[PDB]
Amino acid sequence: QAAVASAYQRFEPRAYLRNNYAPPRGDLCNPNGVGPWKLRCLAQTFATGEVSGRTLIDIGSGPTVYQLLSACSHFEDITMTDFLEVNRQELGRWLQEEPGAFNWSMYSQHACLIEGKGECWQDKERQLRARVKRVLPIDVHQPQPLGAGSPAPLPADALVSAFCLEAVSPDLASFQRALDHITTLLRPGGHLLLIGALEESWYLAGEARLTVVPVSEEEVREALVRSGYKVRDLRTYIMPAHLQTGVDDVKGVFFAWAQKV
Ligand SMILES: C[S@@+](CC[C@H](N)C(=O)[O-])C[C@H]1O[C@@H](n2cnc3c(N)ncnc32)[C@H](O)[C@@H]1O
Ligand SMILES: O=[N+]([O-])c1ccc2c(c1)CN[C@@H](CO)C2
Ligand SMILES: O=[N+]([O-])c1ccc2c(c1)CN[C@@H](CO)C2
């Protein structure tokens, strides 16, 4: 992981956001787009109402919040995390509504649209901003991901992770441990909403050029099982030609709803 942590030193938030959350990938008007698909996944899952609790931790958040727009309405205590201060500064820049904050409103609007509870998007961002108490550092490679004195309520009633594990591990085995490490932050019976890349080996972020470990849905399933989870749901989005730009070589996106037994 020496090489890994060494590559993310050049990782630029603004470029990453521009590469994955601005058009075309950041267009939500097209129903078949990858953004609507992800929001539908989270919305639908929480819509079952069978994923609930007090505290929630977002593993490997980076500069994005979209992954919590639906969840933020089922957990009062939300803990966001990331390995780079640079990302925690960008996140903060959005949370404290500072200047130069990324514009996630398209994603907020689409979440309100999908949930169908007549909620305006300003009110949703408001609620999300309120339930996010802290933004802490994390290293999914450490046996104890958050360290020791962490202000984060452990265990957590639920964990949310999108595009992290596979993007920070050099091999399957490394990805397999990384999963276990965060699985220690969840109480049994708890839930895991995991989103990740499929068969991707690299992606860019400004000056950074990161190496990803190419995982398949079958391997993701097998690792969840081989980690103490029951697969409640496992979905695959096959990346469409028009969303295959020069920013990476991702072939698809997966969503898994896993419960720690
Ligand atoms: C491709 S991004 C995912 C961003 C966001 N969660 C999303 O949905 O687009 C991977 C993130 O993992 C972070 N990261 C790097 N090394 C890490 C490590 N050792 N443990 C945990 N996260 C790490 C990076 O800083 C980056 O924000
Ligand atoms: O299609 N997308 O909306 C989307 C969003 C984020 C990311 C990807 C694709 C692929 N690369 C990952 C990092 O491994 C980050
Ligand atoms: O409860 N479900 O409706 C449901 C639907 C699909 C799947 C599961 C459960 C669990 N196994 C995965 C493997 O990819 C597929």
Curated annotation (Swiss-Prot):
In what way is its activity controlled? Inhibited by methyl methanethiosulfonate, phenylglyoxal, tetranitromethane and diethyl pyrocarbonate. Inhibited by 4-oxo-1,4-dihydro-quinoline-3,7-dicarboxylic acid, 4-(benzo[d][1,3]dioxol-5-ylamino)-4-oxobutanoic acid and 1,4-diaminonaphthalene-2,6-disulfonic acid.
Q: Which residues bind octopamine?
A: E200, D248
| Enzyme class at the top of the EC tree | transferase
Write out the GO cellular component annotations.
cytosol
What changing A156T does, per the record, is: No significant effect on protein expression and enzyme activity with octopamine as substrate
Q: Which domain of life is it from?
A: Eukaryota
Q: Which GO terms describe its biological process?
A: catecholamine biosynthetic process; epinephrine biosynthetic process; methylation
Question: By its UniProt entry, which NCBIfam families does this protein fall under?
Answer: GntF_guanitoxin (NF041360)
Q: Which family does it belong to?
A: Belongs to the class I-like SAM-binding methyltransferase superfamily. NNMT/PNMT/TEMT family.
Q: Describe its function.
A: Catalyzes the transmethylation of nonepinephrine (noradrenaline) to form epinephrine (adrenaline), using S-adenosyl-L-methionine as the methyl donor. Other substrates include phenylethanolamine and octopamine. Also methylates normetanephrine.
Protein name per the record: Phenylethanolamine N-methyltransferase
Q: Which organism is it from?
A: Homo sapiens (Human)
Q: Which gene encodes it?
A: PNMT
